[PDB]
Protein backbone atom coordinates (compact mmCIF):
# COMPACT_ATOMS: atom_id res chain seq x y z
CA UNK A 1 0.00 0.00 0.00
CA UNK A 2 0.91 3.69 -0.13
CA UNK A 3 1.02 5.12 3.32
CA UNK A 4 2.16 8.36 4.90
CA UNK A 5 5.64 8.29 6.50
CA UNK A 6 6.65 10.08 9.65
CA UNK A 7 8.61 12.77 7.55
CA UNK A 8 5.14 13.75 6.04
CA UNK A 9 5.32 12.19 2.60
CA UNK A 10 3.40 9.42 0.91
CA UNK A 11 5.66 6.30 0.42
CA UNK A 12 4.93 2.69 -0.54
CA UNK A 13 5.17 -0.02 2.23
CA UNK A 14 4.42 -3.68 1.77
CA UNK A 15 1.27 -5.36 3.15
CA UNK A 16 1.67 -7.50 6.27
CA UNK A 17 1.57 -11.44 6.33
CA UNK A 18 -1.06 -11.53 9.16
CA UNK A 19 -3.02 -8.97 7.04
CA UNK A 20 -2.63 -11.37 4.06
CA UNK A 21 -3.65 -14.34 6.18
CA UNK A 22 -6.60 -12.38 7.64
CA UNK A 23 -7.76 -11.85 4.02
CA UNK A 24 -7.36 -15.54 3.41
CA UNK A 25 -9.19 -16.56 6.58
CA UNK A 26 -12.21 -14.24 5.87
CA UNK A 27 -12.67 -15.95 2.51
CA UNK A 28 -12.25 -19.36 4.03
CA UNK A 29 -14.82 -18.74 6.72
CA UNK A 30 -17.52 -16.46 5.29
CA UNK A 31 -17.17 -17.38 1.50
CA UNK A 32 -19.73 -15.15 -0.41
CA UNK A 33 -21.43 -13.63 2.80
CA UNK A 34 -22.08 -9.76 2.67
CA UNK A 35 -19.74 -9.05 5.55
CA UNK A 36 -16.99 -9.84 3.21
CA UNK A 37 -17.52 -6.39 1.45
CA UNK A 38 -16.95 -3.96 4.47
CA UNK A 39 -14.22 -6.37 5.53
CA UNK A 40 -12.54 -6.10 2.12
CA UNK A 41 -13.01 -2.34 2.18
CA UNK A 42 -11.19 -1.94 5.53
CA UNK A 43 -8.31 -4.27 4.51
CA UNK A 44 -8.11 -2.38 1.17
CA UNK A 45 -7.45 0.95 2.81
CA UNK A 46 -4.59 2.68 0.99
CA UNK A 47 -4.10 -0.34 -1.27
CA UNK A 48 -2.69 -0.39 -4.87
CA UNK A 49 -4.08 -2.20 -7.95
CA UNK A 50 -1.09 -4.35 -7.75
CA UNK A 51 -2.05 -5.29 -4.17
CA UNK A 52 -5.66 -5.83 -5.21
CA UNK A 53 -4.52 -8.35 -8.01
CA UNK A 54 -2.37 -10.02 -5.35
CA UNK A 55 -5.41 -10.46 -3.07
CA UNK A 56 -7.58 -11.84 -6.03
CA UNK A 57 -4.82 -14.07 -7.36
CA UNK A 58 -4.08 -15.55 -3.94
CA UNK A 59 -7.67 -16.95 -3.65
CA UNK A 60 -8.15 -20.76 -3.61
CA UNK A 61 -11.42 -22.33 -4.42
CA UNK A 62 -14.74 -20.71 -5.71
CA UNK A 63 -13.34 -20.59 -9.24
CA UNK A 64 -16.61 -20.07 -10.92
CA UNK A 65 -17.02 -16.87 -8.93
CA UNK A 66 -13.39 -15.90 -9.47
CA UNK A 67 -13.88 -16.21 -13.19
CA UNK A 68 -17.21 -14.18 -13.02
CA UNK A 69 -15.35 -11.47 -11.17
CA UNK A 70 -12.48 -11.38 -13.68
CA UNK A 71 -14.87 -11.02 -16.51
CA UNK A 72 -16.72 -8.17 -14.56
CA UNK A 73 -13.33 -6.49 -13.91
CA UNK A 74 -12.57 -6.60 -17.74
CA UNK A 75 -16.12 -5.41 -18.53
CA UNK A 76 -15.85 -2.50 -16.15
CA UNK A 77 -12.30 -1.82 -17.53
CA UNK A 78 -13.68 -1.97 -21.23
CA UNK A 79 -16.27 0.52 -20.06
CA UNK A 80 -13.50 2.75 -18.60
CA UNK A 81 -11.82 2.90 -21.95
CA UNK A 82 -15.06 3.54 -23.77
CA UNK A 83 -16.18 6.46 -21.49
CA UNK A 84 -12.81 8.04 -21.28
CA UNK A 85 -11.24 8.31 -24.75
CA UNK A 86 -7.43 8.80 -25.16
CA UNK A 87 -6.43 12.49 -25.18
CA UNK A 88 -5.34 14.86 -27.98
CA UNK A 89 -1.92 14.51 -29.57
CA UNK A 90 1.45 13.28 -28.03
CA UNK A 91 2.18 12.95 -24.33
CA UNK A 92 3.96 16.11 -22.83
CA UNK A 93 7.57 15.70 -21.44
CA UNK A 94 6.49 17.66 -18.39
CA UNK A 95 3.57 15.31 -17.68
CA UNK A 96 2.70 11.75 -17.11
CA UNK A 97 0.27 9.72 -19.18
CA UNK A 98 -3.46 9.27 -18.52
CA UNK A 99 -4.47 5.71 -17.31
CA UNK A 100 -6.50 3.18 -19.27
CA UNK A 101 -8.84 0.34 -17.90
CA UNK A 102 -5.85 -2.01 -17.85
CA UNK A 103 -3.67 0.53 -15.89
CA UNK A 104 -6.55 0.67 -13.35
CA UNK A 105 -6.63 -3.08 -13.30
CA UNK A 106 -2.91 -2.81 -12.66
CA UNK A 107 -2.04 -4.91 -15.68
CA UNK A 108 -0.34 -2.31 -17.97
CA UNK A 109 0.99 -0.15 -15.24
CA UNK A 110 4.06 -0.55 -13.07
CA UNK A 111 4.16 0.22 -9.31
CA UNK A 112 6.13 3.35 -9.71
CA UNK A 113 3.55 4.40 -12.25
CA UNK A 114 0.72 3.54 -9.76
CA UNK A 115 2.56 5.64 -7.08
CA UNK A 116 3.01 8.56 -9.70
CA UNK A 117 -0.72 8.90 -10.29
CA UNK A 118 -1.86 8.60 -6.63
CA UNK A 119 0.98 10.76 -5.07
CA UNK A 120 1.08 13.40 -7.75
CA UNK A 121 -0.93 16.70 -7.52
CA UNK A 122 -3.93 16.40 -8.47
CA UNK A 123 -3.99 12.76 -7.52
CA UNK A 124 -6.17 10.26 -9.40
CA UNK A 125 -8.01 7.51 -7.39
CA UNK A 126 -7.41 4.45 -9.51
CA UNK A 127 -7.80 2.27 -6.28
CA UNK A 128 -11.26 3.67 -5.72
CA UNK A 129 -12.26 3.03 -9.38
CA UNK A 130 -11.08 -0.58 -9.18
CA UNK A 131 -12.71 -0.80 -5.70
CA UNK A 132 -16.17 0.07 -7.11
CA UNK A 133 -15.69 -2.61 -9.86
CA UNK A 134 -14.79 -5.11 -7.13
CA UNK A 135 -17.72 -4.06 -4.99
CA UNK A 136 -20.07 -4.09 -8.06
CA UNK A 137 -18.80 -7.52 -9.03
CA UNK A 138 -19.19 -8.52 -5.36
CA UNK A 139 -22.90 -7.55 -5.57
CA UNK A 140 -23.22 -9.74 -8.72
CA UNK A 141 -21.76 -12.65 -6.87
CA UNK A 142 -23.70 -12.12 -3.61
CA UNK A 143 -26.99 -11.90 -5.65
CA UNK A 144 -26.22 -15.03 -7.60
CA UNK A 145 -24.94 -16.97 -4.65
CA UNK A 146 -28.02 -16.25 -2.61
CA UNK A 147 -30.02 -19.57 -2.59
Amino acid sequence: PIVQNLQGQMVHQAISPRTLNAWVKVVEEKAFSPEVIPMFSALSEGATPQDLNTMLNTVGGHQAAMQMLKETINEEAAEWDRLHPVHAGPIAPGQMREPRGSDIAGTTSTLQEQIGWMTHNPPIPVGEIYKRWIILGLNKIVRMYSP
Partner: protein, 74 residues
Protein backbone atom coordinates in the same frame (compact mmCIF):
# COMPACT_ATOMS: atom_id res chain seq x y z
CA UNK B 1 -5.38 -34.21 -14.42
CA UNK B 2 -5.82 -32.81 -17.95
CA UNK B 3 -8.58 -30.21 -18.93
CA UNK B 4 -10.10 -32.75 -21.44
CA UNK B 5 -10.58 -35.14 -18.53
CA UNK B 6 -12.90 -32.60 -16.76
CA UNK B 7 -16.54 -33.78 -17.30
CA UNK B 8 -19.92 -33.43 -15.57
CA UNK B 9 -21.40 -36.38 -13.73
CA UNK B 10 -24.84 -37.75 -14.48
CA UNK B 11 -26.09 -36.54 -10.96
CA UNK B 12 -23.44 -33.79 -10.41
CA UNK B 13 -24.68 -30.21 -10.32
CA UNK B 14 -23.32 -28.07 -13.13
CA UNK B 15 -22.27 -25.57 -10.57
CA UNK B 16 -19.87 -28.07 -8.97
CA UNK B 17 -18.53 -28.84 -12.46
CA UNK B 18 -18.04 -25.22 -13.45
CA UNK B 19 -15.96 -24.73 -10.31
CA UNK B 20 -13.82 -27.70 -11.33
CA UNK B 21 -13.47 -26.23 -14.82
CA UNK B 22 -12.14 -22.80 -13.85
CA UNK B 23 -9.83 -24.44 -11.24
CA UNK B 24 -8.23 -26.63 -13.97
CA UNK B 25 -8.45 -23.65 -16.44
CA UNK B 26 -6.69 -21.74 -13.56
CA UNK B 27 -3.71 -24.36 -14.06
CA UNK B 28 -3.67 -23.89 -17.80
CA UNK B 29 -1.19 -21.24 -18.89
CA UNK B 30 -2.36 -20.85 -22.73
CA UNK B 31 -3.09 -17.57 -24.63
CA UNK B 32 -6.39 -15.87 -23.62
CA UNK B 33 -7.95 -16.45 -27.12
CA UNK B 34 -7.32 -20.20 -26.71
CA UNK B 35 -8.69 -20.15 -23.22
CA UNK B 36 -11.84 -18.30 -24.64
CA UNK B 37 -12.13 -21.11 -27.19
CA UNK B 38 -11.95 -23.64 -24.35
CA UNK B 39 -14.61 -21.81 -22.41
CA UNK B 40 -17.25 -21.74 -25.11
CA UNK B 41 -16.43 -25.19 -26.34
CA UNK B 42 -15.27 -27.72 -23.83
CA UNK B 43 -17.53 -26.67 -20.92
CA UNK B 44 -20.74 -27.42 -22.84
CA UNK B 45 -19.40 -30.48 -24.60
CA UNK B 46 -18.56 -32.28 -21.34
CA UNK B 47 -21.71 -31.09 -19.65
CA UNK B 48 -24.33 -33.91 -18.91
CA UNK B 49 -27.22 -34.65 -21.48
CA UNK B 50 -29.94 -33.11 -19.23
CA UNK B 51 -28.11 -29.78 -18.81
CA UNK B 52 -26.56 -29.98 -22.20
CA UNK B 53 -30.07 -29.96 -23.61
CA UNK B 54 -30.83 -26.84 -21.39
CA UNK B 55 -27.69 -25.00 -22.55
CA UNK B 56 -28.42 -25.65 -26.18
CA UNK B 57 -31.76 -23.63 -25.58
CA UNK B 58 -29.87 -20.61 -24.14
CA UNK B 59 -28.26 -20.09 -27.64
CA UNK B 60 -24.95 -18.26 -28.08
CA UNK B 61 -24.08 -14.96 -26.42
CA UNK B 62 -24.95 -16.42 -23.00
CA UNK B 63 -23.10 -15.41 -19.75
CA UNK B 64 -22.16 -17.39 -16.66
CA UNK B 65 -24.91 -16.21 -14.23
CA UNK B 66 -27.54 -17.09 -16.89
CA UNK B 67 -25.92 -20.53 -17.54
CA UNK B 68 -25.58 -21.15 -13.85
CA UNK B 69 -29.22 -20.19 -13.10
CA UNK B 70 -30.30 -22.05 -16.26
CA UNK B 71 -29.07 -25.50 -15.16
CA UNK B 72 -30.04 -25.21 -11.45
CA UNK B 73 -32.92 -27.73 -11.29
CA UNK B 74 -31.04 -30.37 -13.23
Amino acid sequence: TSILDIRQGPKEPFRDYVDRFYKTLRAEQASQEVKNWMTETLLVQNANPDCKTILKALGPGATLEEMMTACQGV
